[PDB]
Amino acid sequence: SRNSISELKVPRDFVPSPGTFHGCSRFPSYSNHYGLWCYSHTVSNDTCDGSNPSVQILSVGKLITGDNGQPEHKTLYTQQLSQTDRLYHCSVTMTTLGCYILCSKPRVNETQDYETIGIEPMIIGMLGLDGVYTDLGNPVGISDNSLYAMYPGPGGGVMYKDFLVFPLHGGVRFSEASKMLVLVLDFLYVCTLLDNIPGECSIQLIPPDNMTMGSESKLYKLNNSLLLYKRSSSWWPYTEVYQLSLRVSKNSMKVRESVRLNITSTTRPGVTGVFQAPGIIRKALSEDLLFFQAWTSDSIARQGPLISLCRADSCVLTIPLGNSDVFIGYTDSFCLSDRDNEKIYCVALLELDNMPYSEMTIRSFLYLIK
Amino acid sequence: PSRNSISELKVPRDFVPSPGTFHGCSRFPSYSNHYGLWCYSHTVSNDTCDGSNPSVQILSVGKLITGDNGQPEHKTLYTQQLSQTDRLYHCSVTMTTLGCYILCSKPRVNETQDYETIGIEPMIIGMLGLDGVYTDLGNPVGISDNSLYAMYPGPGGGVMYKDFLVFPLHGGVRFSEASKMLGKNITFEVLVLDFLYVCTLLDNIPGECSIQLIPPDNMTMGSESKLYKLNNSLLLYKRSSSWWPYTEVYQLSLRVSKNSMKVRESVRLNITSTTRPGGVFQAPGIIRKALSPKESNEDLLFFQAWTSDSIARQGPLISLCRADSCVLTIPLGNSDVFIGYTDSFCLSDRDNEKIYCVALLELDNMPYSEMTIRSFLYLIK
Ligand SMILES: *[C@@H]1O[C@H](CO)[C@@H](O)[C@H](O)[C@H]1NC(C)=O
Ligand SMILES: *[C@@H]1O[C@H](CO)[C@@H](O)[C@H](O)[C@H]1NC(C)=O
Ligand SMILES: *[C@@H]1O[C@H](CO)[C@@H](O)[C@H](O)[C@H]1NC(C)=O
Ligand SMILES: *[C@@H]1O[C@H](CO)[C@@H](O)[C@H](O)[C@H]1NC(C)=O
Ligand SMILES: *[C@@H]1O[C@H](CO)[C@@H](O)[C@H](O)[C@H]1NC(C)=O
Ligand SMILES: *[C@@H]1O[C@H](CO)[C@@H](O)[C@H](O)[C@H]1NC(C)=O
Ligand SMILES: *[C@@H]1O[C@H](CO)[C@@H](O)[C@H](O)[C@H]1NC(C)=O
Ligand SMILES: *[C@@H]1O[C@H](CO)[C@@H](O)[C@H](O)[C@H]1NC(C)=O
Ligand SMILES: *[C@@H]1O[C@H](CO)[C@@H](O)[C@H](O)[C@H]1NC(C)=O
Ligand SMILES: *[C@@H]1O[C@H](CO)[C@@H](O)[C@H](O)[C@H]1NC(C)=O
Ligand SMILES: [Ca+2]
Ligand SMILES: [Ca+2]
């Protein structure tokens, strides 16, 4: 590594625009598998808060080495899912067969859902590398009486040891949660990816011992270990990343424990939270943690959005994005490594204020760290 | 023909590229298509696109395909970024069978300072071919130093008229020199008038290029402009430079010769359906011209994304209009919804009773940057 970070022109953004004058897009969801990637977000009209029906956009493509050796996201196929009464809540996971998407289609707002036993309807689908979208129907493995609510993402899932894994968070009664082990907790949706159809799908509860209340989340796969980023939904002020240790068997993956990384380099502005998921370049494995993050700083020295390259306890590089009036909403980042060391590219997916045209829009941006 | 139905369509893939960086702005859409070939271009700077920062120019060529549901789709084949210039680019593009030709001014000073100094600011002409090669054709030949104080093309696009490559211009010429060019004394100091850049396209290289003055008798002061070719006649849309409130479109009658194209007269079409706010460049897409401008304009049909500041309609509008009235109007929002420069063009489907119109809109991008451009698609059935 070196002490250098700069922005690069992205001539062709792989993130599609809302597609109409008053359209808004929210909730970027990204997943890449080696050189293949999948991107998804939710599109509604005027406002993206659930008061209007929405659709989901799903893109798969591949990485090419464009001008100057920087990576480029080449879109191969795009699919729009059917309209839903309110918001989509989706998580995507890229595989060699294509992109799998897990979504919740709420008919009511979040508060009304958590007060009623039973989860809102869900779908799981797949966009193949041949551009064909297959609706795999209702995700199998969901018990009615046990669960009050269940939402995937918005972060992406990962492929772990031939297992299809999605991040979830939902409401489970204390009695039913203790059995598995109304509370709000963090879950994994674990499927076996035998052929083209997922099988042996179940909801695994993550041990909430060292964790905050369940929240919007993202999965990582690093050095054959699972990490979980969580939107801070509690008084805990620091970016939350948990190390997950599993116990794998044939057609069985359960979460044994969840260890919170001691991150104090970046914080949330609250003295709720915002989903601002980092791009993890180097895992901890047990001071070596290095990550890239687009976050909102409320410090006295820096008020406003920042692009940072940070260790667990400190940030080594920071790019101010503007004054406190520059709004960024949800953010998700990921970094692509160059086999030749000492060159790192990170992409920042940013929700941007789009008023008075519509609530929000998403764009991506490219940063070089040398 | 037409009926009372217009609706918007999702543009899954916008052929208009985004500024490409967080604080980037893009301004001054310029578009041109030739049969199934199209060319698009705009100006890109950092933070602000007013000349206070260096800028580059983005240039795209592509082809039209029949996308999902039978609607037209803009497939980009190649994109080119020109070298950085100290201030703004002022560019006009013209799509041909060989590719896209771009004519630009690279001013080193602001517009007021330029019109006070004899001589035009530096200019370039280049071509982006259908083979993806960008060729820098150098300084446009045919521009006289001592006569002209300023010369700016576009931002509207040019046309291919017979074998001539034609670009819209506007610039500053001294009264004596303008009367010479016109042949007659001008009838009501540096005057601001409207010009054409006319070249013969001998093979791959334009030749015998000159600046032609448009007879300003029936016209307002020169301004940002756009060329059209309809029923083998040239039309000129002009940004309003006067108290005259209506969208200005002029009919041009030419006199063609070997290596010579001169403008014989410029007739203002009597358009009263739309007006300019305040001017702002909001150029319409003209679907059907008048078979005889001096006889009537009842056949004129056009599509326009414009700002209405009337008391009855305040805010941006999408309109399908005759010369004297608009038959369909889509409100884009309240008066707080800003659109800047505008350019539209329509693609008709003869078989079906369906017309597609694309609106290129400057949109406010604060506080990220000054401006951004997006395209939007409308179906008229
Ligand atoms: C979308 O929202 C805009 C205002 O943001 C409104 O004018 C328009 O009618 C809406 N369209 C639909 C289909 O609801
Ligand atoms: C959710 O919907 C219920 C239904 O009436 C309403 O009472 C409640 O205020 C809503 N909550 C939010 C946060 O909008
Ligand atoms: C984290 O949680 C696991 C089980 O939930 C527990 O074994 C461990 O002691 C906790 N603290 C750590 C790993 O630092
Ligand atoms: C977490 O890191 C901070 C950084 O200085 C340190 O002060 C604190 O003791 C650490 N916590 C633990 C449990 O080691
Ligand atoms: C672009 O503008 C931003 C603020 O608007 C400024 O911080 C940055 O240095 C500028 N970049 C260049 C290359 O001028
Ligand atoms: C334009 O440039 C001149 C020359 O420096 C300067 O005096 C003037 O203030 C600038 N702005 C104008 C003329 O609006
Ligand atoms: C044309 O105008 C100039 C200056 O106003 C004048 O000196 C000249 O005599 C005029 N010529 C004719 C033919 O009107
Ligand atoms: C002005 O318009 C009239 C008819 O409207 C036309 O006869 C005349 O030639 C025009 N003048 C010029 C200089 O084009
Ligand atoms: C050409 O003129 C004819 C008759 O005046 C008219 O029907 C037709 O629409 C015109 N074509 C265009 C492209 O305006
Ligand atoms: C233009 O046409 C309108 C009728 O649509 C008429 O009222 C107006 O006087 C005309 N203007 C001119 C200059 O002939
Ligand atoms: Ca419920
Ligand atoms: Ca000058």
Distance between the termini of chain A: 6 Å
Q: Quick one: which chains have the greatest interface?
A: A-B, 27 and 26 residues
The sequence of SSEs of chain A as H and E is EEEEEEEHEEEEEHEEEEEEEEEEEEEE
Radius of gyration of chain A, in angstroms, nearest whole number: 19 Å
Strand proportion of chain A: over 45%
Q: Within the largest sheet of chain A, what's the order of strands?
A: 1-26-25-24-19
- Number of DSSP strand runs of chain A: 26
Quaternary state of the chains:
homodimer
Structural class of chain A: mainly beta
Main beta sheet of chain A, described? 5 strands, mixed
Q: What is the general shape of chain A?
A: globular
Number of domains of chain A: 1
Helix fraction bin of chain A: under 10%
Describe what you observe in this structure.
Two copies of one chain form a homodimer. Chain A is mainly β. The first copy, chain A, has one domain (1-370). Chain A has helices at residues 110-114, 174-180; strands at residues 5-8, 23-33, 36-45, 54-65, 71-80, 89-94, 98-104, 122-128, 133-135, 147-152, 158-160, 163-172, 183-193, 198-205, 217-222, 225-230, 240-249, 252-260, 276-277, 279-282, 290-298, 303-311, 315-320, 328-337, 344-353, 360-369. In chain A, the strands form six sheets. A five-stranded mixed sheet of chain A has the order 1-26-25-24-19, with no helix packed on it. In chain A, a hairpin with a 3-residue loop joins strand 6 and strand 7 (98-104). The A-B interface holds A 7-13, 16-17, 19-23, 75, 78, 80, 321-323, 325-326, 352, 356-357, 363, 365 and B 8-14, 17-18, 20-24, 79, 81, 332-334, 336-337, 363, 367-368, 374, 376. Residues 207, 209-210, 257-259 of chain A line the site of one 2-acetamido-2-deoxy-beta-D-glucopyranose (NAG). Chain A: It is a single-pass type II membrane protein. Chain A: GO terms for molecular function: exo-alpha-sialidase activity; host cell surface receptor binding; metal ion binding. Chain A: Ca(2+) binds at residues 113, 116, 118, 148. Chain A: This is Hemagglutinin-neuraminidase.
